[PDB]
Ligand binder design. Sequence first.
Ligand SMILES: Nc1ncnc2c1ncn2[C@@H]1O[C@H](COP(=O)(O)OP(=O)(O)OP(=O)(O)O)[C@@H](O)[C@H]1O
Ligand SMILES: Nc1ncnc2c1ncn2[C@@H]1O[C@H](COP(=O)(O)OP(=O)(O)OP(=O)(O)O)[C@@H](O)[C@H]1O
Ligand SMILES: Nc1ncnc2c1ncn2[C@@H]1O[C@H](COP(=O)(O)OP(=O)(O)OP(=O)(O)O)[C@@H](O)[C@H]1O
Ligand SMILES: Nc1ncnc2c1ncn2[C@@H]1O[C@H](COP(=O)(O)OP(=O)(O)OP(=O)(O)O)[C@@H](O)[C@H]1O
Ligand SMILES: Nc1ncnc2c1ncn2[C@@H]1O[C@H](COP(=O)(O)OP(=O)(O)O)[C@@H](O)[C@H]1O
Ligand SMILES: [Mg+2]
Ligand SMILES: [Mg+2]
Ligand SMILES: [Mg+2]
Ligand SMILES: [Mg+2]
Ligand SMILES: [Mg+2]
Lengths: 267, 267, 267, 267, 267, 267
Amino acid sequence: KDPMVYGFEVEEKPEVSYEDIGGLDVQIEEIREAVELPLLKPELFAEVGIEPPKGVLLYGPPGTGKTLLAKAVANQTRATFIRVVGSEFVQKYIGEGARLVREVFQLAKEKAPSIIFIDELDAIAARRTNSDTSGDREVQRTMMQLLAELDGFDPRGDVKVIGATNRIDILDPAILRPGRFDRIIEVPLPTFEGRIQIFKIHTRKMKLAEDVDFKELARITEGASGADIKAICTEAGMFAIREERAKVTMLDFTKAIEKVLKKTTPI
Amino acid sequence: KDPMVYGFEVEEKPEVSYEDIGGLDVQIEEIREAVELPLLKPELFAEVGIEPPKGVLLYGPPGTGKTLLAKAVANQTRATFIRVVGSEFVQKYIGEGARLVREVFQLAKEKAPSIIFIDELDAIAARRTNSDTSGDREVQRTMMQLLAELDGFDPRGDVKVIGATNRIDILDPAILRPGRFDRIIEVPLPTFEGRIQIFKIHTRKMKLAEDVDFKELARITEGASGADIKAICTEAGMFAIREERAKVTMLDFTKAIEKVLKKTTPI
Amino acid sequence: KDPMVYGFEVEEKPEVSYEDIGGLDVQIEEIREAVELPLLKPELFAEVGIEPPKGVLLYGPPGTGKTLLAKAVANQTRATFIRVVGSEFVQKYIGEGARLVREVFQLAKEKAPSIIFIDELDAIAARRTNSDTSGDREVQRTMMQLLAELDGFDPRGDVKVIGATNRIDILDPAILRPGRFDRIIEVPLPTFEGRIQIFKIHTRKMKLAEDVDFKELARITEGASGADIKAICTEAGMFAIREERAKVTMLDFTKAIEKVLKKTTPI
Amino acid sequence: KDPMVYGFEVEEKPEVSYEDIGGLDVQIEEIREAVELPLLKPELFAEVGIEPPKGVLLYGPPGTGKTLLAKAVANQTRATFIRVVGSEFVQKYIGEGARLVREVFQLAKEKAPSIIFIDELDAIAARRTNSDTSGDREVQRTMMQLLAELDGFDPRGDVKVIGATNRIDILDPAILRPGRFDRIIEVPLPTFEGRIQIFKIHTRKMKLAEDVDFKELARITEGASGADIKAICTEAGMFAIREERAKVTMLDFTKAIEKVLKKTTPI
Amino acid sequence: KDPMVYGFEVEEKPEVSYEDIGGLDVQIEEIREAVELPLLKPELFAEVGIEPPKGVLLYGPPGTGKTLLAKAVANQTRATFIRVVGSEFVQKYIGEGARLVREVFQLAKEKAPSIIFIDELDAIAARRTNSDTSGDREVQRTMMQLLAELDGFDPRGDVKVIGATNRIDILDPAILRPGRFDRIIEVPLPTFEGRIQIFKIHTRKMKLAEDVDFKELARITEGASGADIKAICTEAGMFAIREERAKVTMLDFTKAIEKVLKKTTPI
Amino acid sequence: KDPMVYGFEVEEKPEVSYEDIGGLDVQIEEIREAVELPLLKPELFAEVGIEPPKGVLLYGPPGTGKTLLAKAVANQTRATFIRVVGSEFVQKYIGEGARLVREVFQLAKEKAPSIIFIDELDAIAARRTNSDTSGDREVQRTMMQLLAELDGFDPRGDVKVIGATNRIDILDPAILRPGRFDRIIEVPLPTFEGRIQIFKIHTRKMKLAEDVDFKELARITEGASGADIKAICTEAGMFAIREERAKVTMLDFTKAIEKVLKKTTPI
Ligand SMILES: Nc1ncnc2c1ncn2[C@@H]1O[C@H](COP(=O)(O)OP(=O)(O)OP(=O)(O)O)[C@@H](O)[C@H]1O
Ligand SMILES: Nc1ncnc2c1ncn2[C@@H]1O[C@H](COP(=O)(O)OP(=O)(O)OP(=O)(O)O)[C@@H](O)[C@H]1O
Ligand SMILES: Nc1ncnc2c1ncn2[C@@H]1O[C@H](COP(=O)(O)OP(=O)(O)OP(=O)(O)O)[C@@H](O)[C@H]1O
Ligand SMILES: Nc1ncnc2c1ncn2[C@@H]1O[C@H](COP(=O)(O)OP(=O)(O)OP(=O)(O)O)[C@@H](O)[C@H]1O
Ligand SMILES: Nc1ncnc2c1ncn2[C@@H]1O[C@H](COP(=O)(O)OP(=O)(O)O)[C@@H](O)[C@H]1O
Ligand SMILES: [Mg+2]
Ligand SMILES: [Mg+2]
Ligand SMILES: [Mg+2]
Ligand SMILES: [Mg+2]
Ligand SMILES: [Mg+2]
């Protein structure tokens, strides 16, 4: 009953895999497993006795590759990858958003095995409630619907809903609890070695000089996220273009670390 | 009229069943008194001469369990278990919800004995504040139909409205009270012994455990919810296969209780 | 007659009479003089030269048996009790609501005297703020229709639109102001004499009780509502059932009183 | 002879004349000069040089008696009085419907001089969203149809348009522009002298024995409305029955106002 | 083929070049490298093996000419230009604001290459911590929807935002980080030199000074925005009409510097 | 197809001109400099090289017929007159407030020349909050879209607008900034000589007047507006028809002044 199945991009697998992400290695493995083993290895569960987890919640500072973690799971279990955005519920008609939730779930059930990937939970959950609010009351009646098709009366299924958000601090605690969203995976800012892998992903695409030491660059870029690193390389390339080289030398990388980081914040 | 799955649906199939009556065990006895005792033995109500309780309002924090409770009971009764959901009301068009509330209830009378488990509908029922906005007032109307049909003017038959709500800090005084339920149930976080009963079921499913001490798990899991415990159990399974074991060990619980509460309990 | 208003009428032998309500007590007598006194005797209002009430408004604290009292008066008027519900009005087009208010008043003019009981005046006539727009506008659309008929321009005969509301102020000032609903009878919470009498209605239908002291019973249940007295009674009776006796005694009440009291106090 | 526009007239002179409406007293004269005088002789209005009202809107808080004043107009124009409800202008489907709006105005042109009263413009000149489809289009359409039609037959008296509205703040400017209505008569809540007069007329029909001072009661009932006074009277006679006196006296009104006033804006 | 979002596409083909605006000459070079240049020659990005910039985020005062930098670019690239005022989004009809950014984005992919200018990120950015319980959540739904399309899942599509803001400290963390706006550009009030350039352009549109010297004027105009340097020129022309010369010269220009500053700084 | 106006009311070629205006004689000439004469003479925009005026704001004491001047400028330039009322702006949300600003801008480009009358400036012209508050915020997101759009315009399609306000001293200096509103015109409360000339306009209409001395009338109406002078003349015709004479003289004028205008004195 969905022409919104085009807005769920059921076909077109992404290009981002586990090898297009990295330096968040501990995180890849739990989330990977939380839907990968249930689907390809369900006999392993039988034998030990294991309950299938019914979702994974992801949170973390912005730009750490949450989006990328989701894409990688979607790509590499190739089974029904339902991408929705929580901001996509709630319309001008009086409880259309909640109707709309019921549609995703009945659709996922039919098309099961299925993984639902929700981007942004901050536009569809609130940890407060309030009564007689214009912008914060129907969004609580499409949340309340949600709680409630994911697990509730309606089984299980084979979802496995991957939630993603930029802050869990303004999210309703019903989402926040396990039993559905059973592995609560924090994704932190990357570490010393971590910033080094992220560098090499973009650099793998690029040409470089052979006096390029990642270890030195990663020292400078301490307290920055994966998104700051992508932009550093990009911007470093722009310096390569102006000066007409088909490679990025070490000195551009240091210019870029100074440029990008400086124009974000003065720590 | 024209009923789709709406309430009409009746199902009571597993996982939640009459042998996964995890609790919170005094609380289950209270549901059995309210619903199942006049259903199975009506003559006892003729001797006292009371009106049999008309509904069980279960409330609590999330995941503590009330979906639980209500389905486990429902399989026992073998009654017409009416499943409606918490904002399937007013789909896009208006007063739609008021016609659903009536429909559900009228069919229920015909199919009485019948039980109406409505997920979160008590929480949608909220107060109005003057002047203030015209709201969001229109959904609150759909609540008023529920009061009228339950025993407001039109007899119940043998309904048995099971309420569900994540807050008692969101309700109008006119749903809260014992008058549309009567049997108002606090479902708190599971008792010391209560908590051991939840682990028992899960461990049963998870074969061999021979060094695990469930009581000790209980001291560590002080003031965790019922859905929390089930994820603890799930992650203990997971660490079991990460150590490549056919059974779940005592370390495996220690790690999962540590992981599960950390991400979800504030400092 | 279209199905609509066919089916609004007529409730044959209502449960509830004045020996199935009692305990308040003065405002009971006031309503009964207000509707039953000119219906059974038009002469007394005629001799002074006054107009009987155009309607009677019931408001205030939930649980005081407002709709219950309506079901009492219906049994002794036998003047045609039109049961419409404030939420029953309004559907998926506008003016289809209007149609229904126009139909009930035309129908009533013929049955005159007759009782139009509108469950919630506030559904179809709520305190506006502005258009937010789907059904909110329809509400003040419908309010226009109800006025209009009442004795706005069109002969009322001897109706007698009797209302009730869940909240103090949630209604347009027009309806609030008397001269349309002309007696504003606050049904308040029962008196010291009134709470004893309420327990008595229950005692009538719940067999045996003499170790109970009605006065002291009432004294404890201060600040409760008629629905709460009923709820205690149903709880008490379950208490007795647990100790297996068909007599209700005081100890059964004390346990039952506590259940309700836990909710509402500590202050 | 379409049943809908034929059914909106006539009563062959309603109940109420200017005699039976108590004092305002001076704003009665404004209405008499605004409506009645230009109807009988627009030829005299032209000869003077002035332009008669496009329409006259009655504005004031509820209960001042606005539609009460319209019944008075009705008896004394002698020109066929249209009682229509603006709630019936918007309808369930279309050009019944929209056409009904042009039909009423056509009826006026052949019945002329006449004298069309529409009655509340609450929810037929409010704001639309452009649009919410089923609600809005009806209201937006009917808004335009009203304004064009009254404009195009009044440069000068032909068909006089009268109306009234509950408030002029609950609807957006549309009918407030002096291209449309330019003469809006404040129908206040009544002067000190006005109350005394209303009290007088109501006791005029009433059988009493003289010791009443209508003036003392007026000081008391300052800050009410004419409909409350009517109520005070009906309750003052009802009191008379309860003492079993077939006469009303001062003691009874003083008491009667105390009851009514109390359920109302306060002592 | 809906005029509702198709109207936002091309602005009749701009007339504004990057030599019709200046004074922000450093900033102009930056914008061209990031946005224009990919479109100009793809192979440079291939050569260095980089992912091309997302685009530019401009911040700064008001009047600076953020619009004019998008207008310039659009003329020069020979590609789709979609100009949207970003504060126009956000409706009091809940989730219509989010719908509108969703469609503009999807349409941008249909007509790729495309540039969108989302002006003012102030009124489409909220504060997570409470300040307006209904205003923050609403704004947030619009914000996280446009972000969703921006790189939540759905590709760039060779879009190319390009988007301005008065205040950058009011933005949520989500949009603030790069990778949804790759190159954050400071665009400050005109420098010393910046005055002289802006002036010169605008006086080439007039009759031009006869007694040229923009350095004197510049000293005085320091501490104003770019619109304000223009503004003086326009004030100068009209002053010319009042004098009865209608030719602009240094005397009109200096008298204008004074006349606009009279308002501005208040000695 | 028939056209149906939006941004109501619209008068394409309004028939009120400056012949209908008297005693505001130099205020006509200033505003002819502001909009009229620029617009019909495109030579000025080449002979000076000036970039057109974008608005002129009318100020000084209210009630003077600021709407009427606006119509007279629209008449002269043969444009589409468009009315924006400020009461249809700002609620306590936003967005349809915003929408309607957009609407009249769209209509105005489409049908240039076009005169957007913008009363009233005090509900979208107000001060800034940078210490924050919530109520002020509604106004600020509305206000920026007026400010922007007017500057956004292309010189292909000239949408000149004429503002009007009661108090300029409560508004932001930002809308008193040249290149938005270039000049302001004190339309003052009428002088002695002004009042005599405004009575004469109305007298054209009125019959046999040869006893009326206009001077004694102006004296009495010290501190009277133009809307009040016009209203006095309608009322004069009412008084004349009360004394049963179609001849309007001076006695009628004197009673009309007392009745309408004289209320204000004493202080
Ligand atoms: N884990 C990482 N590995 C490699 N690249 C990364 C990593 N994190 C971020 N990036 C780069 O930064 C870009 C932009 O960040 P992205 O859009 O992926 O973030 P997100 O964490 O979902 O953000 P938000 O909190 O704003 O929703 C990526 O497309 C990638 O090029
Ligand atoms: N007491 C229990 N024993 C065993 N497992 C439980 C228990 N309570 C909850 N769970 C498990 O937790 C999961 C989700 O919780 P459930 O649906 O029962 O929550 P609820 O308290 O009704 O919440 P919400 O406020 O989100 O509607 C199910 O998998 C259920 O079996
Ligand atoms: N005076 C009374 N004596 C006995 N029982 C009473 C009395 N008044 C109320 N009750 C009981 O209280 C309950 C509520 O009655 P009712 O169904 O009339 O709702 P209400 O007070 O109109 O409610 P709402 O605010 O939910 O519309 C019933 O169970 C009724 O039997
Ligand atoms: N001046 C008056 N003289 C006599 N009776 C009055 C007076 N004013 C009001 N009433 C009484 O009030 C009623 C008529 O006015 P009513 O209260 O219906 O309101 P309205 O001002 O037309 O309201 P709305 O805006 O709700 O349509 C009658 O019952 C009448 O007896
Ligand atoms: N730097 C500048 N060079 C030339 N014109 C300018 C410059 N800055 C602003 N303007 C002009 O001033 C007017 C309004 O400024 P605009 O660019 O719309 O403002 P904002 O930065 O607030 O978006 C326009 O007519 C615009 O051309
Ligand atoms: Mg993200
Ligand atoms: Mg639940
Ligand atoms: Mg009730
Ligand atoms: Mg009325
Ligand atoms: Mg701009």
